Amino acid sequence: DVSFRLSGADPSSYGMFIKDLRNALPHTEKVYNIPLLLPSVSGAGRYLLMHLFNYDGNTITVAVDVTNVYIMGYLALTTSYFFNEPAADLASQYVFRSARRKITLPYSGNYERLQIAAGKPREKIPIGLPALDTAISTLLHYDSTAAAGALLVLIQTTAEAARFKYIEQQIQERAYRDEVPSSATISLENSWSGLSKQIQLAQGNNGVFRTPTVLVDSKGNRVQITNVTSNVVTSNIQLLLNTKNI
Ligand SMILES: *[C@@H]1O[C@H](CO)[C@@H](O[C@@H]2O[C@H](CO)[C@@H](O)[C@H](O)[C@H]2NC(C)=O)[C@H](O)[C@H]1NC(C)=O
Numbered sequence: 185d186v187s188f189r190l191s192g193a194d195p196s197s198y199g200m201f202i203k204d205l206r207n208a209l210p211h212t213e214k215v216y217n218i219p220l221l222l223p224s225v226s227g228a229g230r231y232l233l234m235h236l237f238n239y240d241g242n243t244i245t246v247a248v249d250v251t252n253v254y255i256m257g258y259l260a261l262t263t264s265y266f267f268n269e270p271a272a273d274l275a276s277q278y279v280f281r282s283a284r285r286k287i288t289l290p291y292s293g294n295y296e297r298l299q300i301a302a303g304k305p306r307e308k309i310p311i312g313l314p315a316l317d318t319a320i321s322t323l324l325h326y327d328s329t330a331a332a333g334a335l336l337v338l339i340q341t342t343a344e345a346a347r348f349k350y351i352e353q354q355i356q357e358r359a360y361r362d363e364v365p366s367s368a369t370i371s372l373e374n375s376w377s378g379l380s381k382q383i384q385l386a387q388g389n390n391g392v393f394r395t396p397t398v399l400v401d402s403k404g405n406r407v408q409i410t411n412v413t414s415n416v417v418t419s420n421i422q423l424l425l426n427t428k429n430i
């Protein structure tokens with residue numbers, strides 16, 4: 185399991201938690217020197233338990249599918265919550281089994297369904313460690329609408345940041361002050377599946393993408409990524425979704 189405590193949190197420890205998070209996802213091959221997540225993992229080995237603690241010491245344990253880094257649900261005190269999606273329901277059969285009760289959330293884990301439940305897109309949701317501390321708290325006490333929001337904060341704080349070095353940086357900049365994600369942050373999140381597929385097709389295409397990826401950069405300008413030499417691939421992305429799952 186991996187852990188992060190906000191009490192005393194700073195860019196340094198958040199860095200370590202996100203480093204641990206990356207270290208817990210299994211791979212057996214690297215593509216252009218970037219861990220390639222497994223196609224599948226059978227059983228309970230498929231789920232990683234993150235222990236998160238809000239500033240007052242309360243905790244939630246989040247379950248993550250180690251082959252894609254999708255959050256499946258979480259345990260808050262003695263209740264468990266899982267998205268309304270097949271993978272989550274399957275996941276429910278291996279984790280938080282001893283929860284006194286299980287709540288299926290009213291919506292699957294997609295950013296689209298989550299934003300509708302929350303009443304706003306992510307573009308308007310402040311993130312940062314403080315925001316992550318509100319999220320831990322919100323989820324300790326079931327509220328479907330507030331959870332939609334807390335969950336968009338949680339996924340980004342933890343999954344996207346593990347997947348992208350740039351996102352981890354955005355959060356470290358937001359250690360004591362939340363702020364809506366830069367649009368390049370939203371682009372990366374949206375292009376992960378695609379970059380992952382393209383980093384892999386390039387393997388036998390001399391490092392060239394079969395299809396380019398359109399991104400938004402630091403300045404807010406639209407750039408096209410067409411080969412492995414880009415900074416997105418050399419520095420930025422830290423994990424790849426196996427094409428067997430794309
Ligand atoms: C691979 O992408 C690189 C950019 O990352 C391309 O090289 C650059 O492309 C033009 C010059 O032709 C400029 O806009 C960049 O500043 C160049 N960068 C560098 C460092 O040289 C390259 O052409 C792409 N290759 C393919 C096959 O698409």
Ligand SMILES: OC[C@H]1O[C@](O)(CO)[C@@H](O)[C@@H]1O
Binds near residue numbers: 254293294295
């Ligand atoms: O936008 C939908 C996507 O949002 C995520 O929660 C985070 O990347 C994924 O589980 C899903 O594919």
